[PDB]
Design an enzyme around this catalytic site. Structure first.
Site, short mmCIF file in Angstrom:
data_model
loop_
_atom_site.label_atom_id
_atom_site.label_comp_id
_atom_site.label_asym_id
_atom_site.label_seq_id
_atom_site.Cartn_x
_atom_site.Cartn_y
_atom_site.Cartn_z
N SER A 17 28.57 -1.17 -146.93
CA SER A 17 27.28 -0.57 -146.85
C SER A 17 26.21 -1.69 -147.32
O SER A 17 26.38 -2.25 -148.19
CB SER A 17 27.31 0.91 -147.72
OG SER A 17 27.55 0.64 -149.06
N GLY A 19 21.93 -1.12 -148.93
CA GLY A 19 20.72 -0.40 -149.24
C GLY A 19 19.58 -1.11 -150.07
O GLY A 19 19.65 -2.45 -149.72
N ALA A 20 18.77 -0.53 -150.76
CA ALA A 20 17.67 -1.46 -151.36
C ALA A 20 18.34 -2.47 -152.36
O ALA A 20 17.84 -3.54 -152.16
CB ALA A 20 16.88 -0.18 -152.31
N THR A 23 24.15 -5.66 -150.48
CA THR A 23 25.20 -5.22 -149.58
C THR A 23 26.37 -5.06 -150.46
O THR A 23 26.36 -5.72 -151.70
CB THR A 23 25.17 -6.29 -148.83
OG1 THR A 23 24.03 -6.76 -147.91
CG2 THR A 23 26.49 -5.70 -147.52
N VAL A 24 27.15 -3.85 -150.04
CA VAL A 24 28.40 -3.33 -150.71
C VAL A 24 29.44 -3.95 -149.93
O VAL A 24 29.69 -3.50 -148.83
CB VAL A 24 28.52 -2.16 -151.19
CG1 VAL A 24 29.77 -1.84 -151.94
CG2 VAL A 24 27.29 -1.69 -152.25
N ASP A 138 18.01 5.08 -161.32
CA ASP A 138 18.31 5.37 -159.99
C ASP A 138 19.54 6.14 -159.65
O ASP A 138 20.37 6.25 -158.83
CB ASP A 138 18.43 4.07 -159.12
CG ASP A 138 18.28 4.45 -157.45
OD1 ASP A 138 17.87 5.58 -157.29
OD2 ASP A 138 18.45 3.50 -156.76
#
EC number: 2.7.11.1
Length: 279
Positions: A17, A19-20, A23-24, A138
């Site tokens: 995945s 996101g902000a 990357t994972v 977050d």
């Protein structure tokens, strides 16, 4: 005291995945022969000596976090064109998945839901009690990661100067459902995380998406700045929920419009401890 893992020790990088915050990917550590996760940035623009030492000092601070319900930083991957944070791999994904994938888990028992809630609270509590304090800023259902036996590990805490880096490497945006209304107009406020915790606690007990019917995220942002919250009634939070009264108290104090009105995590723990002795 933060180790450097050279790029070459991370084999079989499978994308998971993005996101902000980057990357994972999953990977196998070539020496440890276990799976690891890596949050990483492919850095397009070259990056100033000042700007690099910043992100490293952050990671170094975050490395100091060592607690049962915190996902610990294992090491930093520091390459000319690649920055990466290496962490334990969490086999069971996130709390998001446990709640909303209702096909794969038709039934999430009360003792487990409450243990999750306790562990999140112990996690953020630990973070806040460090010197200096480490604030998450977050916290969300996607960050609450679940290990092999469904215990909590909180991820992505304190990723402030890191998130400004993945800003820089553009020239989309993350969910705001767990964001307190003060933060909309950008801060260093200890009472941010408890707001998020409260929305999470609502989501855990309801098993419902907060603001499900509201299509536009700006609509949500206006609504909450005017003091609207996920709805509390018999439909969203059934009467059979253990300690329903006490939990609604915690939720409402948690997502209070006035920051000063919101409890510390120590307060959550004191309130939760009785609830858990039931089980």
């Amino acid at each position: 005291a933060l180790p450097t893992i050279p790029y070459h020790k991370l084999a079989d990088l499978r994308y998971l995945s993005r996101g902000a915050s980057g990357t994972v990917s999953s990977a196998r550590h070539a020496d440890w022969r276990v799976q690891v996760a890596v949050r990483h940035l492919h850095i397009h623009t070259p990056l100033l000596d000042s700007e690099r030492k910043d992100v490293l000092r952050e990671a170094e601070i975050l490395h100091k976090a060592r607690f049962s319900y915190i996902l610990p930083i294992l090491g930093i991957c520091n390459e000319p064109e690649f920055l990466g944070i290496v962490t334990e791999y969490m086999p069971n994904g996130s709390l998001n998945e446990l709640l909303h994938r209702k096909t794969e888990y038709p039934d999430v028992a009360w003792p487990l839901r409450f243990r999750i809630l306790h562990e999140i609270a112990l996690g953020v509590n630990y973070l806040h009690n460090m010197t200096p304090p480490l604030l998450h800023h977050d916290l969300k259902t996607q960050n609450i990661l679940l290990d092999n036996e469904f215990h909590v590990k909180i991820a992505d805490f304190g990723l402030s100067k890191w998130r400004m880096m993945s800003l820089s490497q553009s020239r989309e945006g993350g969910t705001i459902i767990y964001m307190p209304p003060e933060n909309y107009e950008p801060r260093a406020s200890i009472k941010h995380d408890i707001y998020s915790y409260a929305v999470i606690t609502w989501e855990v007990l309801s098993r419902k998406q907060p603001f499900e019917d509201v299509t536009n995220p700006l609509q949500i942002m206006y609504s909450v700045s005017q003091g609207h919250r996920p709805v509390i009634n018999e439909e969203s939070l059934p009467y059979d929920i253990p300690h329903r009264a006490r939990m609604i108290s915690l939720i409402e104090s948690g997502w209070a419009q006035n920051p000063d009105e919101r409890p510390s995590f120590l307060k959550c723990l004191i309130e939760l401890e009785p609830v858990l002795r039931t089980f």
